[PDB]
Amino acid sequence: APSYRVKRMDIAKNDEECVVNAANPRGLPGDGVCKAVYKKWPESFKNSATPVGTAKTVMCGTYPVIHAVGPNFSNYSESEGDRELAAAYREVAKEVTRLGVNSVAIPLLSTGVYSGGKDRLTQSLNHLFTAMDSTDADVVIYCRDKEWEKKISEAIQMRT
Ligand SMILES: CC1=NC(=O)N=C(C(=O)O)C1
Q: Where are the beta strands (DSSP E) in the chain?
A: 4-8, 19-22, 55-60, 63-68, 103-107, 138-143
Q: Is 20 in the pocket of ligand 1 (CB under 6 A)?
A: no
Distance between CA atoms of 85 and 53, rounded to whole angstroms? Answer: 6
Which structural domain range is residue 12 located in? Answer: 1-160
Distance between CA atoms of 134 and 116, rounded to whole angstroms? Answer: 29
Q: Work out how many domains the chain is built from and give that number.
A: 1
* 97 C-alpha to ligand 1 centroid (Å): 22
CA-71 nearest atom, ligand 1? 5
Resolution (angstroms) stands at 2.0
Q: Following DSSP, what letter does each residue of 5-46 receive, concatenated?
A: EEEES-GGG--SS-EEEE--TT----STHHHHHHHH-GGGGT
Residue 28, C-beta contacts closer than 8 angstroms, at least 6 positions apart: 45
Q: Is 54 in the pocket of ligand 1 (CB under 6 A)?
A: no
* 105 C-alpha to ligand 1 centroid (Å): 15
